[PDB]
Structure formats: structure tokens, C-alpha cells
Design an enzyme around this catalytic site. Structure first.
Site, PDB file in Angstrom:
ATOM      1  N   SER A   1       0.858  -1.179   0.000  1.00 28.23           N
ATOM      2  CA  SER A   1       0.000   0.000   0.000  1.00 28.23           C
ATOM      3  C   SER A   1       0.896   1.232   0.000  1.00 28.23           C
ATOM      4  O   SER A   1       1.115   1.865   1.036  1.00 28.23           O
ATOM      5  CB  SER A   1      -0.917  -0.004   1.234  1.00 28.23           C
ATOM      6  OG  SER A   1      -0.173  -0.046   2.442  1.00 28.23           O
TER       7      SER A   1
ATOM      8  N   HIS B   1      -4.074  -6.007   3.798  1.00 26.46           N
ATOM      9  CA  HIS B   1      -2.898  -6.798   4.169  1.00 26.46           C
ATOM     10  C   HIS B   1      -3.212  -8.252   4.525  1.00 26.46           C
ATOM     11  O   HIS B   1      -2.296  -9.044   4.762  1.00 26.46           O
ATOM     12  CB  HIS B   1      -2.165  -6.142   5.344  1.00 26.46           C
ATOM     13  CG  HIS B   1      -1.104  -5.169   4.928  1.00 26.46           C
ATOM     14  ND1 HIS B   1      -0.242  -4.579   5.826  1.00 26.46           N
ATOM     15  CD2 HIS B   1      -0.755  -4.696   3.707  1.00 26.46           C
ATOM     16  CE1 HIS B   1       0.593  -3.786   5.178  1.00 26.46           C
ATOM     17  NE2 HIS B   1       0.303  -3.839   3.890  1.00 26.46           N
TER      18      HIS B   1
ATOM     19  N   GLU C   1      -3.489  -2.312  10.257  1.00 27.59           N
ATOM     20  CA  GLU C   1      -2.595  -2.845  11.284  1.00 27.59           C
ATOM     21  C   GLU C   1      -2.992  -2.477  12.707  1.00 27.59           C
ATOM     22  O   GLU C   1      -3.618  -1.446  12.953  1.00 27.59           O
ATOM     23  CB  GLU C   1      -1.159  -2.357  11.047  1.00 27.59           C
ATOM     24  CG  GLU C   1      -0.776  -2.262   9.590  1.00 27.59           C
ATOM     25  CD  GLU C   1       0.616  -1.679   9.380  1.00 27.59           C
ATOM     26  OE1 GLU C   1       1.276  -1.295  10.371  1.00 27.59           O
ATOM     27  OE2 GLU C   1       1.042  -1.608   8.210  1.00 27.59           O
TER      28      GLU C   1
ATOM     29  N   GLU D   1       3.430  -9.717   7.226  1.00 26.30           N
ATOM     30  CA  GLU D   1       4.260  -9.148   8.274  1.00 26.30           C
ATOM     31  C   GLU D   1       4.361  -9.980   9.540  1.00 26.30           C
ATOM     32  O   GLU D   1       4.777  -9.479  10.585  1.00 26.30           O
ATOM     33  CB  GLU D   1       3.777  -7.739   8.599  1.00 26.30           C
ATOM     34  CG  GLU D   1       4.150  -6.755   7.502  1.00 26.30           C
ATOM     35  CD  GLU D   1       3.491  -5.410   7.664  1.00 26.30           C
ATOM     36  OE1 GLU D   1       3.304  -4.964   8.815  1.00 26.30           O
ATOM     37  OE2 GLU D   1       3.173  -4.800   6.626  1.00 26.30           O
TER      38      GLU D   1
ATOM     39  N   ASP E   1      -2.813   1.524  12.646  1.00 23.43           N
ATOM     40  CA  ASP E   1      -2.520   1.971  11.294  1.00 23.43           C
ATOM     41  C   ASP E   1      -3.759   1.650  10.480  1.00 23.43           C
ATOM     42  O   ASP E   1      -3.922   0.534   9.996  1.00 23.43           O
ATOM     43  CB  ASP E   1      -1.315   1.258  10.678  1.00 23.43           C
ATOM     44  CG  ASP E   1      -1.055   1.718   9.258  1.00 23.43           C
ATOM     45  OD1 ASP E   1      -0.135   1.213   8.590  1.00 23.43           O
ATOM     46  OD2 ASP E   1      -1.784   2.611   8.791  1.00 23.43           O
TER      47      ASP E   1
ATOM     48  N   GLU F   1      -2.035   5.882  12.660  1.00 24.78           N
ATOM     49  CA  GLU F   1      -1.429   6.189  11.372  1.00 24.78           C
ATOM     50  C   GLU F   1      -2.490   6.233  10.268  1.00 24.78           C
ATOM     51  O   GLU F   1      -3.408   5.412  10.255  1.00 24.78           O
ATOM     52  CB  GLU F   1      -0.375   5.123  11.051  1.00 24.78           C
ATOM     53  CG  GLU F   1       0.048   5.046   9.588  1.00 24.78           C
ATOM     54  CD  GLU F   1       1.158   4.031   9.356  1.00 24.78           C
ATOM     55  OE1 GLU F   1       1.300   3.543   8.199  1.00 24.78           O
ATOM     56  OE2 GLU F   1       1.891   3.732  10.329  1.00 24.78           O
TER      57      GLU F   1
ATOM     58  N   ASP G   1       1.534   8.600   6.728  1.00 22.76           N
ATOM     59  CA  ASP G   1       2.246   7.646   5.875  1.00 22.76           C
ATOM     60  C   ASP G   1       1.914   8.013   4.437  1.00 22.76           C
ATOM     61  O   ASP G   1       2.688   8.712   3.785  1.00 22.76           O
ATOM     62  CB  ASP G   1       1.821   6.190   6.147  1.00 22.76           C
ATOM     63  CG  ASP G   1       2.620   5.186   5.312  1.00 22.76           C
ATOM     64  OD1 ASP G   1       2.318   3.967   5.357  1.00 22.76           O
ATOM     65  OD2 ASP G   1       3.562   5.627   4.604  1.00 22.76           O
TER      66      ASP G   1
ATOM     67  N   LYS H   1      10.007   5.896   5.537  1.00 21.31           N
ATOM     68  CA  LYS H   1      10.220   4.785   4.619  1.00 21.31           C
ATOM     69  C   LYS H   1      11.292   5.214   3.628  1.00 21.31           C
ATOM     70  O   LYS H   1      11.037   6.008   2.722  1.00 21.31           O
ATOM     71  CB  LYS H   1       8.936   4.465   3.868  1.00 21.31           C
ATOM     72  CG  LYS H   1       7.866   3.795   4.708  1.00 21.31           C
ATOM     73  CD  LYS H   1       6.602   3.572   3.881  1.00 21.31           C
ATOM     74  CE  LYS H   1       5.570   2.752   4.643  1.00 21.31           C
ATOM     75  NZ  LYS H   1       4.324   2.516   3.843  1.00 21.31           N
TER      76      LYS H   1
ATOM     77  N   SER I   1       9.994   2.759   9.221  1.00 23.94           N
ATOM     78  CA  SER I   1       9.149   1.665   8.793  1.00 23.94           C
ATOM     79  C   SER I   1       9.723   0.713   7.761  1.00 23.94           C
ATOM     80  O   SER I   1      10.551   1.067   6.921  1.00 23.94           O
ATOM     81  CB  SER I   1       7.820   2.220   8.265  1.00 23.94           C
ATOM     82  OG  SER I   1       7.044   1.200   7.660  1.00 23.94           O
ATOM     83  N   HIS I   2       9.252  -0.517   7.859  1.00 19.85           N
ATOM     84  CA  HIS I   2       9.624  -1.581   6.953  1.00 19.85           C
ATOM     85  C   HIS I   2       8.567  -1.475   5.853  1.00 19.85           C
ATOM     86  O   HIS I   2       7.702  -0.591   5.892  1.00 19.85           O
ATOM     87  CB  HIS I   2       9.463  -2.926   7.665  1.00 19.85           C
ATOM     88  CG  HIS I   2       8.059  -3.195   8.119  1.00 19.85           C
ATOM     89  ND1 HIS I   2       7.648  -4.418   8.606  1.00 19.85           N
ATOM     90  CD2 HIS I   2       6.965  -2.392   8.158  1.00 19.85           C
ATOM     91  CE1 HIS I   2       6.366  -4.358   8.922  1.00 19.85           C
ATOM     92  NE2 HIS I   2       5.929  -3.138   8.659  1.00 19.85           N
ATOM     93  N   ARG I   3       8.631  -2.385   4.888  1.00 21.42           N
ATOM     94  CA  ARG I   3       7.645  -2.444   3.812  1.00 21.42           C
ATOM     95  C   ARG I   3       7.066  -3.858   3.871  1.00 21.42           C
ATOM     96  O   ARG I   3       7.745  -4.782   4.309  1.00 21.42           O
ATOM     97  CB  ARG I   3       8.292  -2.216   2.440  1.00 21.42           C
ATOM     98  CG  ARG I   3       9.001  -0.880   2.250  1.00 21.42           C
ATOM     99  CD  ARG I   3       8.308   0.273   2.976  1.00 21.42           C
ATOM    100  NE  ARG I   3       6.979   0.605   2.477  1.00 21.42           N
ATOM    101  CZ  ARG I   3       6.734   1.259   1.346  1.00 21.42           C
ATOM    102  NH1 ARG I   3       7.728   1.654   0.565  1.00 21.42           N
ATOM    103  NH2 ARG I   3       5.482   1.515   1.000  1.00 21.42           N
ATOM    104  N   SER I   4       5.818  -4.031   3.447  1.00 22.16           N
ATOM    105  CA  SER I   4       5.191  -5.348   3.479  1.00 22.16           C
ATOM    106  C   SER I   4       6.099  -6.391   2.810  1.00 22.16           C
ATOM    107  O   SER I   4       6.015  -7.587   3.104  1.00 22.16           O
ATOM    108  CB  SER I   4       3.823  -5.298   2.788  1.00 22.16           C
ATOM    109  OG  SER I   4       3.947  -4.877   1.441  1.00 22.16           O
TER     110      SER I   4
ATOM    111  N   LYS J   1       8.624   0.434  13.427  1.00 23.43           N
ATOM    112  CA  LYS J   1       7.742  -0.697  13.208  1.00 23.43           C
ATOM    113  C   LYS J   1       8.338  -1.494  12.047  1.00 23.43           C
ATOM    114  O   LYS J   1       8.444  -1.001  10.921  1.00 23.43           O
ATOM    115  CB  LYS J   1       6.311  -0.253  12.878  1.00 23.43           C
ATOM    116  CG  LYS J   1       6.100   0.345  11.514  1.00 23.43           C
ATOM    117  CD  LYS J   1       4.628   0.589  11.292  1.00 23.43           C
ATOM    118  CE  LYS J   1       4.339   0.842   9.834  1.00 23.43           C
ATOM    119  NZ  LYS J   1       2.896   1.097   9.623  1.00 23.43           N
TER     120      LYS J   1
HETATM  121 MG   LIG Z   1       0.747   2.794   6.401  1.00 22.55          MG
END
Ligand SMILES: [Mg+2]
Ligand SMILES: [Mg+2]
Ligand SMILES: [Mg+2]
Lengths: 433, 432
Positions: free
Chosen positions: B39, B157, B166, B209, B244, B292, B317, B342, B369-372, B393
Site C-alpha cells: 500500500s 494486508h 494494522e 508481516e 494503522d 497512522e 504515511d 520509509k 518503517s519496513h515495507r510489506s 515498526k
Molecule cells: Mg501505512
């Protein structure tokens, strides 16, 4: 020589504590980590856990880390031995432990240190890990293995009724390893769609090994899905099927239960004779060429029977637990023609290489394997190459504790250049290539 | 100076190709990999893909890889620039791309190099990565971040009727980062048991995740589960909840659909005001301290109004997409008070650090942040520390592409010996 050793507690792919070791030498810093299994055979090298119920549910590994920092470290440092001497340093730890199953220090403590030393030894020799490993095993011409992706998890690896544990795809028809990755990844993705469209989206989540865990029971259903995904991806003449029943996980009173995750019911029980009949159907209906743990770890009888009829590969797991003693017996009784190589089951690199040779010299095949609880460590990648086994199963092309291995393998093939050779259809006997 | 740069196509945590770079110098080899977000915001840098619908479902990244080996590599090397020169090297790449969104070479092709350069630079400075990042950012007081674990998934997700994306648990009361990992893991294992005892074993599998996705509809039910896991794990006074919503996912014609994963029925759509009221209740009944993307990326009126009527953390985000420009408007309009960082969303290390300082400069909080779609790479672990954001996260405590980051953070803390601090209850403003 070893300068300093320092271990710590890190988390594996399931969220549980595990052992990690930092080993220092004038050449630099070398680190390794120990995997952990979910479906472990009773004859496995003891894994020492803390047992402190008020911490990580007792899954902590502080005791194993302490044994390393306070006892093993000064012991290996005093030895003055160089990290190149894998066999010597490994024995010192075996002797210092003093137990047959490594129950004093834990197989996880000894293995962690053994792995770190191997990495340091390779560097001391200015050779990549897989090269050093080959020299230890006494090999020359390395060969890239065929990957076996567990695209459908079951048993104790995922939440569902499915009895059987793993359903794998093997890209034997690939052009190379890098190409084998594309085939497996593509089939896996197609498989997600087949499951989504046939069982719904809420059934596209993955298990411990990255494989999909749909809500089914039939073992033939899982086989039909995989066969479909493969064909739907246009790889019927290139990718075959492999599987790990893990019967020991559902062994109950001399009877294999295909529904142990459900409330006990002796009514739904089958005999080893029955269980074997089912495989004979799978082998004839699907492109199955390998079946791991088709029976219990103590049902030697059935094993020798099955192998005598089928012409496919029969992999031993809990039956041999990467243990020379258990292997000698299976070799003698021809219970199987392939060994699953799990380093943490024996507890040290030296023994794992020795265990691989024992298999190979007896005309058996060898498939290097991960544990359902893995880490970002990629040692087994260089391992399977250095031992030229020709086959490795380290998860579905999903979840990085798995991809970390497959990525490292693609790098090794890159590093070998023209000398890179894919096992292919000779994954069982790459010595001919 | 750079001696060699070789890019390759590896696979991410979801089985999709991505960029990995090897950067050689007198001090050895330095590798880094680029993640891939699901996303993603529509303003962020562009991720280049081959488009060959026959190969990796058109997700191949061979092109981006070539833009590196064939064009970037000779360029950066011939410049003779030192790897310690992050800005000069990133800029040189930025201009070589030309576009204002790295669409010529691909943000993934550019970032892959940007990272490998930073790691090499740290070696050039004979310092650990997180320390070098701190020098580039101009910080000296390193601090460990509070981890935010995504335990329950929804929206786009996972598979269910759950609208919100999330639901994270933050061990703000842990004694240290190491301790925070135990609290998170323990709660995670407790949660899996709760879901098994209520929704069945078939509902304990993980999503992209590492979190669980039980078939549920009410977002309040999700909050309820988390609250129970926490209390049953015995950490009610030490673990809080992060949210989130990813509202852009269910924004529909100026309204919102909290059931958009069920045949379109516009008769249920709710207004931003109605949605914000729902949030207010969540903040009242649950230990929610951070939300978020509570609204659509362009629903500025709702962001600013909400942020002005609550005291919790409001994370942008899809709103800010780690973009200076976008962030400037959010700051000026007080759209939110925390920026999700990100790196692949912006494209370069220098720009990412630039984006983080801009936020912190205006009293904003920053969450890395990480990514999916992640990789075994752990750069962001060293980043969140060197930038002192106090929060990150990078997944639930499951799946190594997530545990890789968390384990690195524990090393870093160990490496910091006594001079080590944990954001704790000050994850919003660790600067104190
Ligand atoms: Mg987000
Ligand atoms: Mg097992
Ligand atoms: Mg097995």
C-alpha cells in the site's frame, strides 16, 4: 587462533529465543546462529532450553549462551588451534561436553560455536565458505542443488486439519539455480491464486515455512493443488513433487492418525500397511519423486518394505536424525535411499559432514535441510554446495529466513561463474555431472 | 573511492524480485537490499519493474539492475568520490536520473546503491553503521526505539472483513530494547493462543508481516483481542496499542467504507467526522496512543481537525510519503504530528535523513518503517538508532525479514554497553 567468543540470545523465525555466536580472529568478526525444529525426533541431539516458565515460556536459551561464554570460549582459545582445524575444535567441544547427546552444553551451544569457527576458518584460508566446506568434506567440483519449496504447510507447521506436513516442488528441469528460483517463485504465486479462487482469500496466509495453509484435510487435495499450480504456470515438464509426511508427528499406538490436530478419536486410525497404500496412489497419480518420513521413526519394518517396491526417493528424517548410528541401521536394512541433513540434529559441522559422507558412500542421496524455526543465517547454503549433495529443502520462496538461503545460493552460482553446474535431474546423484 | 558496484536480482520476503548491490572498496565488500511496499502512496518515488508479464508476473527488476551496473557504477566510480560523501554521491545519482521521482533509473535501483555506499562509508570512518548515520544526521545522543509489533492485520494486508490495516503493540514500559523483545514475543505467543481458543487453529497462520488475520469485522474486536493478549501475558501496565488504519484503502467518493471488502454498498459509507468519532471511542476504551493514516491521503480537513482534537500521536504515511514537500504542507496545516519514515519511499539515504530532520525540527515524532515486502537486510535497524527517532515498526515478532531488524537492534544495544538508553515512555519525544 581464536581471540574472543561471545554468544547472545536472538529470536528465530517463530519468535522464540535461539543461540547466536560471534567469533573473533585477526581476520575479522564471524557470526552464526542456530535453527530450531517443531517436529523433532526423540533421537535428536538435545536442545538445551532454560525452562524458566516466566520467560519466553521457558523457551529461553541463556544457559546455552553462558556455557559458551564462560566455558567453551576459554577452552577453545587456550587450545591455540586455528579456526581452519574444524575437526579438532569440534572434538574438543564434544569431549568437553562429555555426553552422547550433547546434554551438558546443549547441541545448540556447541553447533553455534562450530558454525562460527567454520566461517572463520574459510576466511583464514581466503576461500568462500562453500569452498572451505568442500575442502573439509574432501570435494572439488561444486554443484548447485535443486531447491525443494514447501509450498503447502501442514501438521505441526500450520493451523489446519491437513495431516501430512510438507508438499514440495522441485524444479529439476530448470536451466540453472537462478532459473529454478523463478520457476518455484512463479508456481508459488500461481498457487496463491488457485487457493484464493478455490478456497477464498482468507486461506492465502502462510505457515512456519512460508507455504500456504488452507483449511483442508485430504492429503490428495494438497497434491492436486500443487499439480494444478505447476501446470497452470506451464512447467509440467520441468517441476516435480516431493513431500514430507512426518508420520512420527501423528503416531499413536502402532497406528498412524491422519487427524491428530483434531480431538482424539481412535475410530479414524490407519495402519502402516494402509498408510503405505496411499503413497502408492500418490506416486502414480502425481509427479511425486520423493517421500520423506513415510512412516514412524521406529517402524523400521514398513520402511524397508516401501523402499523395496517404489523406485522413487525415500528420505529419512526422524528415522535417522542425521545420526551415524541410526543411519548405519537404515543402510543395513535399506530402510531408505536418502538422508535429510539437519546440522542441529547431530550438533556439529564435523559430524554433519561425516554423516553426509556415510550416506554418499553407501549410494544414498543427501538433501540438506533447514528447521521449521530458522534464522537469517545462511550457512546451509554454502553447506549443500560444499557437500555437492545436489538437493536442499529450505522453505517456500516466502519468508526471509527461507529466502536468505535461496538468495545466497544464487550468489554462489554467480560466484562460480562458468564453473557453476546445476544438479537438475541428477539431484539424487550429481557426481555424474 | 568506489572500486566496483554489482547489482543483482534477489527475492524479497514475498517471493518477488528486488535490488541488491555489492560495493567494493579497499576495505572489502558491502551489500544492501531494497524493500518493496504494498500500500504505497501515489506521491512517493517510483519503483521500476521490468513489466514482463511472462516473467515473475511482470515483477522482474532486471531493468533497474542494469541501470545500476551499466550506468550508475561507472559514473560513481569515475567521480573518485569517497563513500563517506553520502550527500555528494546521492546527489550525483539524483541528477543522473533527472526526474524528480527517480523514474528513469527507479528508486529501487538508486536506493540499492545509496545504502551500500552508506555502509561502506561507515567502514571508511571506522565506525559501526548506526554511528555513521548519526554523524550524517548530526546527532550524538543515540537511543534505542520502542518496537511496534503488527500482531493483527486487516484492510488490504490480509483476508477478512477487517477494515483497519494494522494493530500494533508497543512495549513502552519494557526495561530495555532486549526486554521489549521479550514482552512483544510473549504477548504474540499469548495472542496466538487466544485466537486458537476463540476462532480455531485454522486462524493462527501469519500474514506478510508475521501477524494473524482472524476472520472478523469489528475493528473494536481487533482491539479487544490485543488487549486480552496483553493482560493475559501480564503486561497491562507496560504495553500500549498502535494503530494503522490506512484510510486511503477504503476512501470512497469523499466518504469511507469500513466494509469495503464485501460487495460495494455505498449506503453504509460514513463521513470523516463519523470516522473520527469512532477513533475517539477507541482512544477512550482502549490503550491506543498512536494512529497512522486515520484519513485519506488528501483529506487534509479531517487530518488537521482530528489532530487538533486529540492528544495521541497522529502518524502520516500515505499522507507524507516521506516527501519533504508533502511534509511541509502537513507541518504548516498541522495535519499530523509524526512522520512514518520509509527510505525506499524517498529513494536515498541523504534525502531520508533530510526528511527525518525536517519533521523533528517541528516537534514531530518519527517512526521508521519496513515495507510489506522486506529482505534479510537490516539497514533501518541502524537508521532508527542513528536518527534517534525513538520508534520503529518492522513487523510482528515473526518471519526473519522482520526478526532480522529486531535482532540487530539488540546487538546495537549490547554494543552500546552502559551508554545505552531505551526510549521507553518517551518514544514520542526521546530527545528529552
Ligand atoms: Mg501505512
Ligand atoms: Mg520434523
Ligand atoms: Mg522432516
Amino acid at each position: 587462533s581464536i581471540e574472543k567468543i561471545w554468544a547472545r540470545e536472538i529470536l528465530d523465525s517463530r519468535g522464540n529465543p535461539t543461540v547466536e555466536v560471534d567469533l573473533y580472529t585477526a581476520k575479522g568478526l564471524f557470526r552464526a546462529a542456530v535453527p530450531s525444529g517443531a517436529s523433532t525426533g526423540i533421537y535428536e541431539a538435545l536442545e538445551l532450553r532454560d525452562g524458566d516458565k516466566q520467560r519466553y515460556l521457558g523457551k529461553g536459551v541463556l544457559k546455552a549462551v553462558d556455557h559458551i561464554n564462560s566455558t567453551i570460549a576459554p577452552a577453545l582459545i587456550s587450545s591455540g588451534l586455528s579456526v581452519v582445524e574444524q575437526e579438532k575444535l569440534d572434538n574438543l567441544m564434544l569431549e568437553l561436553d562429555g555426553t552422547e547427546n550433547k546434554s551438558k552444553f546443549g547441541a545448540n551451544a556447541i553447533l553455534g560455536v562450530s558454525l562460527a569457527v567454520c566461517k572463520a576458518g574459510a576466511a583464514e584460508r581466503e576461500l568462500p565458505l562453500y569452498r572451505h566446506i568442500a575442502q573439509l568434506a574432501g570435494n572439488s567440483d561444486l554443484i548447485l542443488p535443486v531447491p525443494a519449496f514447501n509450498v503447502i504447510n501442514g501438521g505441526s507447521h500450520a493451523g489446519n486439519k491437513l495431516a501430512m506436513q510438507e508438499f514440495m516442488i522441485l524444479p529439476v528441469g530448470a536451466e540453472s539455480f537462478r532459473d529454478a528460483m523463478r520457476l518455484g517463485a512463479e508456481v508459488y504465486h500461481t498457487l496463491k491464486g488457485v487457493i484464493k479462487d478455490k478456497y477464498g482469500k482468507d486461506a492465502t496466509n502462510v505457515g512456519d515455512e512460508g507455504g500456504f495453509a488452507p483449511n483442508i484435510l485430504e492429503n490428495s487435495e494438497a497434491l492436486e493443488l500443487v499439480k494444478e499450480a505447476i501446470d497452470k504456470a506451464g512447467y509440467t515438464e520441468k517441476i516435480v513433487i516431493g513431500m514430507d509426511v512426518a508420520a512420527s508427528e501423528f503416531y499413536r499406538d502402532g497406528k498412524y492418525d491422519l487427524d491428530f490436530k483434531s480431538p482424539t478419536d481412535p475410530s479414524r486410525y490407519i495402519t502402516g500397511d494402509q498408510l503405505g497404500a496411499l503413497y502408492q496412489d500418490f506416486v502414480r497419480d502425481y509427479p511425486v519423486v520423493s517421500i520423506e518420513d513415510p512412516f514412524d521413526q521406529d517402524d523400521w519394518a514398513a520402511w524397508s518394505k516401501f523402499t523395496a517396491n517404489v523406485g522413487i526417493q525415500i528420505v529419512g528424517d526422524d528415522l535417522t536424525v542425521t545420526n551415524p548410528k541410526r543411519i548405519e541401521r537404515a543402510v543395513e536394512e535399506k530402510a531408505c535411499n536418502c538422508l535429510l541433513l539437519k546440522v542441529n540434529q547431530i550438533g556439529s559441522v564435523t559430524e554433519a559432514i561425516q554423516a553426509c559422507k556415510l550416506a554418499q558412500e553407501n549410494g544414498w542421496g543427501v538433501m540438506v535441510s533447514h528447521r521449521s524455526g530458522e534464522t537469517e543465517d545462511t550457512f546451509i547454503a554454502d553447506l549443500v554446495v560444499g557437500l555437492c549433495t545436489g538437493q536442499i529443502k529450505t522453505g517456500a520462496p516466502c519468508r526471509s529466513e527461507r529466502l536468505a538461503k535461496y538468495n545466497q545460493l544464487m550468489r554462489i552460482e554467480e560466484e562460480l561463474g562458468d564453473e557453476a553446474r546445476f544438479a537438475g535431474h541428477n539431484f539424487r546423484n550429481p557426481s555424474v555431472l
